[PDB]
Scaffold this active site. Structure first.
Site, PDB file in Angstrom:
ATOM      1  CG  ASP A 226      -6.069   2.606   3.979  1.00 30.83           C
ATOM      2  OD1 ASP A 226      -5.451   1.531   3.832  1.00 30.83           O
ATOM      3  OD2 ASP A 226      -6.899   2.806   4.899  1.00 30.83           O
ATOM      4  CD1 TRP A 227      -2.323  -2.382  -0.690  1.00 29.18           C
ATOM      5  CD2 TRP A 227      -1.643  -0.643   0.550  1.00 29.18           C
ATOM      6  NE1 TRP A 227      -0.963  -2.502  -0.501  1.00 29.18           N
ATOM      7  CE2 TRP A 227      -0.516  -1.431   0.232  1.00 29.18           C
ATOM      8  CE3 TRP A 227      -1.457   0.518   1.312  1.00 29.18           C
ATOM      9  CZ2 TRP A 227       0.763  -1.120   0.685  1.00 29.18           C
ATOM     10  CZ3 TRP A 227      -0.181   0.847   1.717  1.00 29.18           C
ATOM     11  CH2 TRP A 227       0.908   0.026   1.417  1.00 29.18           C
TER      12      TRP A 227
END
Length: 791
Positions: A226-227
């Site tokens: 996930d970022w």
């Protein structure tokens, strides 16, 4: 696997060609959205982008579809397949290769932030829709990352929270939809969540990613972080991660190249991970030498039409009294509420996009109704304290270097911002001119973080910083805008507005915000009551905002923003024939049901929502929605804990979430899972089950042609401490003309009878007598049958 063998041969050749420095480089991100390119092996840069309702690209418009729960409320995975096809077309057009969607985390608590972005509280319905969505996106040769693997069913402290979840609970609930999509749709990728499950962070979780997802289910795609979720070079590689994708300086690249050379991190592990990325490269088509997976693409799709169809097919008509809807021919209609003029089509978070144009309920009903269109009266404004500067703002986006010299001017869309510039760029102005609509005190703000300097009419009203203690910078950006200064501007007379941001050392986005001058809430409700008094029916559009419903944080209560509840009651008192159009993405308290004639949940209905709502209200079409989630009061709600105490979130309810939890506690909700009404009656006349195949005959016993979702619910005859009383085991949407009968051959999955053996590490088909019941909802079970689970 015929052409896949030939494709995986080209992957092996490419893996062999690359050297340790290029291998480690590939797994590390390049920009906010793309991976490095390797012309030495004919590999192009992998472009990734958000997301569930539309494709953004690299901010250089999109088609905004109705929210994911809206797609799930249609109960039609064929619509989700078509939705995915359109999104693959959008991605092909914007040059995107991988779509960062769909979100399939369950609706554990009604306070969850991204609740509007998930499909359902039931893992079967979630898996079915998710399966259709992924097959459709990949039908246009575009990859997908099924997010957020696994148990990211809340946003507070999501960066660090340790979600302690049971063995059966993970296997039966939170992992189920992922297994369903892995087996049915064959997804090309997956995204690992920021949180931790039973100790390990999802990006570094060796057991769930490598042993369960890949080992048991046979997942063959890539695993993206996930970022900003990647946080260990060795911990993430060994825990099954493949791509640290937050941005340019990722945990992979040169730290990974070094860890292989120096530490006990084997180059075989790196090779196993690059192989996955190069397999994705070949399917999406970015690798020359390996033919693309989808060569001939699906026939063009009209985006506007699908947005309208998905929208009206999802609107759940929960309440309709004697028949408030549809509206009568030549009736005096009064549209009330701010959400009717300025609609909320998307929910807040990374899932946001900018559509070409949006049809609002007032735009749609004005055209649908004749001369003397809906008499509009704004009842209350939910979009405050602040809102993005757009109405009356004419802004440009100026780029400056260290010497403040201008090095470009992009066109501003409205206020938000994220050409021939690079590490030289020092600051970004957002200048323009603002013509005020009404005299008074206009407030100006920003949604961003870092250095800001605001100058409304020369005078520098603000020049400071905006730091925060939070563990996540994404919570900080999509947080509520912060007011920087109040200013007195007379209407008509415009002034020069300016907001500058200094940038230097991930963080690179801001937006100018503005609040319209003060409007009395009580006088707004007074002028709306006059319109309620002056009409045959009142249509009040009530809505939750992008500030209330968004990623990064959870809601505080299920109550409606602003003085909207007080608006509804005032209108319901003045006019009995009141129709409340709830434009909310997650469950919301409806304390005035007894007073209002009808209630229609429309979710965040996309750019064509106003046209679909106008069609439904007038009676051109029927609201085809059936609740994908149980709606009810927060006090009645048995599973609400979103906040982690001592940095831990225990999932004590276990196998019981949503309807399963309401049954376990005797609490009956306001509207149950699978509830919804159309514009016709349905009489279930026959149910025949042969082994595990239920066949249901249903009759349209109403005045008009319509759709019905047939819902089959399995339930053991014996007591079940170990299991829920009933649960969904199959469904099917059928259409029929009045009097006409339609059948439905729905096969209940083998899984509907099974439960998880924690010790054996296997599924257990629970034998015995069950009650298979066909119905309109869980509470509206029409016909029952008793069967023995087959061998």
């Amino acid at each position: 696997t015929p052409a896949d063998e030939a494709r995986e041969a080209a992957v092996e050749k490419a893996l062999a060609a690359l050297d340790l420095d290029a291998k480690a480089r590939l797994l590390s991100g390049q920009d906010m959205w793309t991976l490095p390119a390797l012309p030495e092996i004919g590999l192009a840069s992998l472009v990734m982008s958000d997301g569930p309702i539309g494709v953004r690209g690299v901010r250089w418009p999109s088609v905004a579809l109705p929210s994911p729960t809206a797609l799930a409320a249609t109960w039609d995975p064929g619509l989700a397949r078509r939705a995915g096809v359109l999104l693959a077309q959008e991605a092909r057009r914007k040059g995107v290769h991988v779509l960062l969607a769909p979100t399939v985390n369950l609706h554990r608590s009604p306070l969850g932030g991204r609740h509007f972005e998930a499909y359902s509280e039931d893992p079967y319905l979630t898996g079915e829709i998710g399966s259709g969505y992924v097959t459709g996106v990949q039908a246009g040769g575009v990859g997908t990352t099924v997010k957020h693997f696994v148990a990211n069913d809340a946003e507070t402290d999501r960066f660090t929270v340790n979600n302690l979840v049971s063995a059966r609970a993970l296997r039966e609930l939170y992992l189920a939809p992922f297994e369903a999509i892995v087996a049915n749709a064959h997804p090309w990728g997956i995204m690992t969540a920021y949180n931790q499950v039973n100790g390990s962070t999802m990006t570094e979780h060796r057991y769930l990613v490598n042993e369960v997802l890949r080992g048991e289910w046979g997942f063959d795609g890539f695993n993206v972080s996930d970022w900003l979720a990647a946080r260990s070079t060795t911990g993430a590689l060994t825990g099954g991660l493949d791509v640290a994708m937050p941005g340019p300086a990722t945990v992979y690249g040169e730290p990974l190249a070094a860890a292989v050379r120096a530490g006990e991190v084997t180059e075989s592990l790196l090779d196993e991970a690059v192989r996955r990325v190069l397999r994705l490269a070949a399917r999406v088509g970015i690798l020359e030498g390996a033919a693309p997976a989808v060569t001939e693409l699906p026939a063009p799709v009209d985006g506007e039409a699908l947005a309208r169809e998905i929208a009206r097919r999802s609107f759940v008509l929960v309440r309709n009294e004697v028949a408030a809807l549809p509206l009568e021919q030549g009736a005096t209609v009064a549209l009330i509420g701010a959400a009717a003029r300025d609609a909320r089509v998307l929910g807040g978070g990374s899932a946001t996009v900018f559509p070409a144009r949006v049809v609002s309920p007032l735009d749609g009903l004005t055209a649908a109704l004749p001369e003397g269109a809906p008499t509009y009266a704004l009842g209350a404004d939910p979009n405050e304290e602040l809102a993005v500067a757009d109405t009356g703002f004419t802004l440009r986006a100026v780029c400056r270097d260290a010497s403040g010299t201008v090095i470009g001017t992009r066109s501003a869309p409205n206020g938000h911002i994220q050409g021939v510039t690079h590490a030289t760029l020092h600051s970004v102005e957002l200048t323009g001119t603002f013509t005020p609509r009404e005299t008074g005190t206009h407030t100006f703000g920003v949604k961003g973080l870092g250095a800001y300097t605001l100058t409304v009419d020369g005078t520098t009203h603000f020049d400071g910083v905006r730091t925060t203690d939070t563990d996540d910078p994404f919570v900080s950006f999509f947080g509520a805008p912060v007011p920087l200064a109040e200013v007195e501007l007379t209407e008509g007379t415009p002034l020069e507005v300016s907001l500058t941001h200094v940038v230097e050392l991930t963080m690179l986005a801001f937006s100018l915000c503005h609040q319209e001058p003060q409007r009395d809430p009580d006088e707004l409700i007074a002028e709306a009551v006059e319109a309620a008094r002056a009409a045959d029916t009142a249509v009040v559009v009530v809505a939750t905002t992008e500030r209330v419903e968004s990623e990064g944080f959870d809601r505080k209560d299920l109550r409606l923003p602003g003085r909207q509840d007080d608006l509804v009651r005032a209108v319901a008192a003045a006019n009995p024939a009141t129709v409340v159009v709830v434009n909310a993405g997650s469950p919301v308290e409806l304390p005035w049901r007894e007073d209002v004639a009808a209630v229609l949940l429309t979710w965040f209905p996309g750019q064509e929502g106003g046209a679909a709502l106008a069609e439904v209200l007038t009676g051109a079409h029927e609201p085809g929605g059936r609740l994908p989630t149980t709606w009810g009061s927060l006090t009645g709600a048995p599973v609400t804990q979103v906040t982690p105490t001592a940095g831990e979130l225990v999932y004590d309810e276990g196998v019981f979430i949503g309807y399963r939890a309401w049954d376990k506690e005797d609490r009956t909700p306001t509207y149950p899972f699978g509830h919804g009404l159309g514009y016709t009656d349905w009489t279930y006349e026959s149910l025949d089950v042969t082994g595990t195949t239920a066949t249901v005959r249903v009759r349209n016993t109403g005045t008009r042609e319509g759709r019905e979702t047939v819902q089959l619910y399995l339930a053991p005859t014996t007591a079940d401490e170990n299991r829920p009383t009933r649960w969904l085991a199959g469904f099917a949407t059928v259409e029929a003309a009045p009097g006409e009968t339609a059948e439905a051959v729905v096969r209940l999955p083998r899984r509907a009878f099974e439960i998880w053996d924690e010790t054996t590490g296997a599924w257990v088909y629970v034998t015995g007598s069950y009650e298979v019941a066909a119905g309109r909802s869980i509470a509206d079970r029409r016909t029952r049958v008793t069967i023995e689970a087959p061998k």
